[PDB]
């Protein structure tokens, strides 16, 4: 009676060792719906993403081997799609549908390194009509949302305060931080000045009306990427 949704930033699916280790990690985790960022697939190369057990795959790619987002739905989930909006530039994809009589809107987002919070606010504006009270927005936001998302506990910048306001008008909240308020976990690891630096830039934001449905969430380290996956279970 529950479905599992998972977001992972994948760091490229062009090679087939990569695709095979994704498929078997996805098999293990066995999610209903899976949102993936940084496919690096061209739109000529969309056909290259096949995952045994996950045949329904919606993709928004760019004409280069950069960006690239997919939403994969498992063969065992009866998902009836009603709307799909793909970014021309491969940085977001929205799919609306229903699973067993319940409507669900998933916006999968890969914001850019630079100008991230401004980019997301603009995307929420372009897609204003489509947002509703059963909306999940997941992916690599390339930005913290709260002070506890940062190792330094520094205040969020004014751009990200601006995004936070915009989300609050759409009645969207950070689902992970809401279910785990004191969390000081991170989702992203890089090398900065010859040392490791940790951040929490991958999020599951969603409609505050969906909180009633949320069972477990958890962050999942992996050897597929420098990003950790977030998994969410809902009623």
Method used for this model? Answer: X-ray
* Helix/strand/coil for 20: helix
CA–CA separation, 104 and 90 (whole Å) = 22
The boundaries of the domain holding residue 197 are 1-235
Contacts of 182 (CB under 8 A, 6+ apart): 148
Q: Give the number of domains in the chain.
A: 1
CB atoms within 10 A of CB 187: 25
CATH number of the domain bearing residue 121? 3.60.10.10
- What is the β-pairing status of strands 102-110 and 79-86? unpaired
CA 199 to chain centre: 16
CA–CA separation, 90 and 101 (whole Å) = 30
Resolution of the experimental model, in Å, one decimal: 2.3
């Amino acid at each position: 009676s529950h479905i599992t949704i998972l977001t992972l930033n994948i760091n490229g699916l062009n090679s087939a060792i990569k695709r095979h280790r994704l498929a078997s990690w996805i098999k293990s985790q066995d999610p209903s719906v899976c949102c993936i960022q940084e496919t690096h697939l061209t739109c000529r190369d969309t056909h290259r993403l096949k995952i045994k057990g996950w045949r329904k795959i919606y993709q928004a790619n760019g004409k280069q081997k950069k960006a690239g987002v997919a939403i994969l739905v498992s063969d065992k989930t009866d998902f009836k799609p009603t709307k799909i909006k793909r970014d021309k530039e491969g940085h977001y994809i929205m799919v609306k549908g229903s699973i067993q009589q319940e409507e669900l809107t998933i916006l999968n987002i890969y914001a850019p390194n630079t100008g991230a919070p401004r980019f997301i606010k603009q995307v929420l504006s372009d897609l204003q009509r489509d947002l509703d009270s059963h909306t999940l927005i997941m992916g690599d936001f390339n930005t913290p949302l709260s002070t506890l998302d940062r190792s330094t506990r520094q205040k969020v910048n004014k751009d990200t305060q601006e995004l936070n306001s915009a989300l609050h008008q759409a009645d969207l909240i950070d689902i992970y931080r809401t279910l785990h308020p004191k969390s000081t976990e991170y989702t992203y690891v890089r090398v900065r000045d010859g040392h490791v630096s940790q951040s929490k830039i991958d999020h599951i934001v969603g409609s505050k009306a969906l909180l009633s449905k949320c069972k477990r969430t958890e962050i999942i380290t992996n050897y597929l990427s420098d990003h950790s996956a977030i998994k969410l279970e809902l009623r």
